[PDB]
Design a protein around this ligand. Structure first.
Ligand SMILES: CO[C@@H]1O[C@@H](C)[C@@H](O)[C@@H](O)[C@@H]1O
Ligand SMILES: CO[C@@H]1O[C@@H](C)[C@@H](O)[C@@H](O)[C@@H]1O
Ligand SMILES: CO[C@@H]1O[C@@H](C)[C@@H](O)[C@@H](O)[C@@H]1O
Ligand SMILES: CO[C@@H]1O[C@@H](C)[C@@H](O)[C@@H](O)[C@@H]1O
Ligand SMILES: [Cl-]
Ligand SMILES: [Cl-]
Ligand SMILES: [Cl-]
Ligand SMILES: [Cl-]
Ligand SMILES: [Cl-]
Ligand SMILES: [Cl-]
Ligand SMILES: [Cl-]
Ligand SMILES: [Cl-]
Ligand SMILES: [Cl-]
Ligand SMILES: [Cl-]
Ligand SMILES: [Cl-]
Ligand SMILES: [Cl-]
Ligand SMILES: [Cl-]
Ligand SMILES: [Cl-]
Ligand SMILES: [Cl-]
Ligand SMILES: [Cl-]
Ligand code: NA
Ligand code: NA
Ligand code: NA
Ligand code: NA
Ligand code: NA
Ligand code: NA
Ligand code: NA
Ligand code: NA
Lengths: 346, 346
């Protein structure tokens, strides 16, 4: 090789054969990827390989229900583009355009029927969407709008009853959301406010007990969170603070035993984290340091050994990596590369 | 409230809200279920509740891609019957017939497009199948045959590339299998032999690295296993012995960190187990005892705290339960009930 907290720089997944794969953007705007050779913590890596393209968003990878990776990104023409594996253990298609004009990073989820659906802000600052017409395959539907006015990158998750739900910051800086009223459908609720004042993109995750929980940096630069109180249903909890003082977007992942763990850059530019103790219903720890000097938000994922691995850009613009050990965490190692923050919203 | 090793007596799942739910059969041939109140190891249980019906197979629960449980069982008329949740946190439909004439327990998996497909032996001892015509819903297709001649209950899994694959003992007592040539399709391979001599129903599981691995009791009453050598592909390994002397069918589950663990009744009628050490690619332990005096094969599942829980019938015909603790395993406790082995093949 109008603002939000500093973004995550890579998109990462644990793939169908248990290997982590990371996607980023280089200075000449191509998408690059790196993957583990073996399905274990501390595996050697491929090194960075270019998938070409010319992107103007964060590239976002998603796993189709047949196991094939597909990467979505905004192009220089502001259309949504994508590229996909022709088989789970094979090569890639060419980059192809799905048209439209978009103004955020794309957000992707599979419906219960296997059709990917993609969400992205439009030129009008509404949330637009487009979907595969058949499971894990093109061709795609026409674009349409779910309205609203949003000021952050959107994030989508699936409820435990199969209904997609999308979250995004509004013009009043509150967290807003909208949901499918039935799985696989084009029937959506109205937008509703969950209030709060947020200063990062929201992060959403499903708990062990089937509730959506959303994390975001607050107006005080603490990490805050809010959750569904009943599985796949409102009412939501109040916003609750997890404290800390964070200088990037947060990242969240589940441990082996479903205990949630949040990561973010701190005031000293080190990686910090806080986790649930005891169980997935337990109280959160104090914030503790994992060291490093990072120039992006962290990106967290659980590997095939059930350990968390965290990636973040370094002062040299390489991607660095630390992971959980029995005792502690490993020292930061470099995966090299030269990565940029290509986020469509900053 | 012509033979195979003693069966598992209940069907168990970790549900969309993280609670274990178990399904069995009572002396008057109704299906009963029991569920955890809370999504944690050692949760109190509902106790046994009747779903009615009159069944002549093991009842087998499967989770639809919208999170709704659906239970399948052979009826007194030898047709396939089923009953389903009307919503993930709600009640059940009435029992409804999907017709056909079947001679094994049903085996179920969701295609990548969300359509359940059910496999069962016919009166001709071939493998027949039927599927939902749309994702997570009826109506269902017509019945059709995938041929073969089988002598055990069949088991189905999905490959890491989304192709269903079914395993069953043949007339020569070898393990045979057959697979979809494409996800979601009605295009199947020929039946092929994986050789060996097996004396239980086969158990199939996906490894962390996307390979199918099959377990079964051998002619020597040891536990044996065999696996795909490449993710979602042949060639298969040789049959390899895990030793032991087992007096029931084996059960297998994955730990938190993806380490496989096998369970079976021993010559002393206690529960015994053997596990991978170190990681999901590590060597297997010696067989060790979990005590108890059991009158069925064990049934193993990972709970929402990432601990294994094992269920087995006791000398009083109640269902008993032991689970992993930090140090060891818990003492057996009774969930009550009076359960029978309703397996369509014994
Ligand atoms: C539907 O409501 C519109 O979109 C929301 C997400 C908010 O930005 C709100 O201020 C705006 O009026
Ligand atoms: C531990 O190493 C420190 O953190 C890494 C993430 C890099 O920024 C490196 O330049 C720095 O010395
Ligand atoms: C297709 O082959 C048929 O079915 C297999 C599963 C075996 O029972 C074999 O002996 C029989 O001839
Ligand atoms: C530990 O308790 C023993 O095992 C249970 C599974 C039951 O069979 C019980 O009758 C027996 O005393
Ligand atoms: Cl580049
Ligand atoms: Cl190496
Ligand atoms: Cl290209
Ligand atoms: Cl509102
Ligand atoms: Cl997210
Ligand atoms: Cl703190
Ligand atoms: Cl995994
Ligand atoms: Cl940059
Ligand atoms: Cl009964
Ligand atoms: Cl209690
Ligand atoms: Cl009924
Ligand atoms: Cl053959
Ligand atoms: Cl199985
Ligand atoms: Cl041994
Ligand atoms: Cl779970
Ligand atoms: Cl019995
Ligand atoms: Na991979
Ligand atoms: Na995986
Ligand atoms: Na998402
Ligand atoms: Na994001
Ligand atoms: Na449940
Ligand atoms: Na679950
Ligand atoms: Na199965
Ligand atoms: Na079985």
């Amino acid at each position: 090789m109008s603002t939000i907290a500093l973004s995550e720089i890579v998109s990462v997944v644990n793939t169908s054969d248990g290997r982590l794969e990371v996607f980023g953007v280089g200075t000449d705007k191509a998408v690059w990827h790196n993957r583990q050779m073996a399905p274990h913590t501390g595996s050697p890596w491929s090194g960075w390989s270019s998938l070409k393209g010319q992107v103007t968003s964060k590239p976002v990878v998603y796993i189709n229900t047949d196991g094939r990776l597909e990467v979505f990104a905004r192009g220089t023409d502001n259309a949504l583009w994508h590229i996909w594996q022709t088989a789970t253990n094979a090569g890639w298609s060419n980059w192809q355009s799905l048209g439209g004009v978009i103004t955020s990073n794309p957000a992707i989820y599979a419906n219960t029927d296997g059709r990917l659906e993609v969400f992205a802000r439009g030129a009008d600052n509404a949330l637009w969407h487009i979907s595969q017409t058949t499971a894990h395959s093109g061709p795609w539907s026409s674009w349409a709008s779910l309205n609203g006015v949003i000021t952050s990158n959107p994030t989508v998750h699936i409820n435990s009853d199969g209904r997609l739900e999308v979250f995004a910051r509004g013009t009043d800086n509150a967290l807003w959301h909208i949901w499918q009223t039935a799985p696989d459908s084009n029937l959506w609720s109205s937008w509703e406010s969950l209030n709060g004042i947020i200063t990062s993109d929201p992060v959403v995750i499903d708990t062990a007990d089937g509730r959506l929980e959303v994390f975001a940096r607050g107006a005080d630069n603490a990490l805050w969170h809010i959750w569904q109180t009943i599985s796949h249903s409102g009412p939501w909890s109040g916003w609750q603070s997890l404290n800390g003082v964070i200088t990037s977007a947060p990242a969240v992942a589940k441990n082996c035993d479903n205990r949630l763990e949040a990561f973010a850059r701190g005031t000293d530019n080190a990686l910090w984290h806080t986790w649930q103790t005891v169980s997935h219903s337990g109280p959160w720890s104090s914030w503790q340091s994992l060291n490093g000097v990072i120039t992006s938000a962290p990106t967290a994922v659980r590997d095939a050994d059930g350990r968390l691995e965290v990636f973040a850009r370094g002062t040299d613009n390489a991607l660095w990596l630390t992971w959980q050990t029995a005792s502690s965490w490993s020292p930061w190692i470099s995966l090299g590369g030269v990565l940029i923050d290509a986020s469509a919203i900053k």
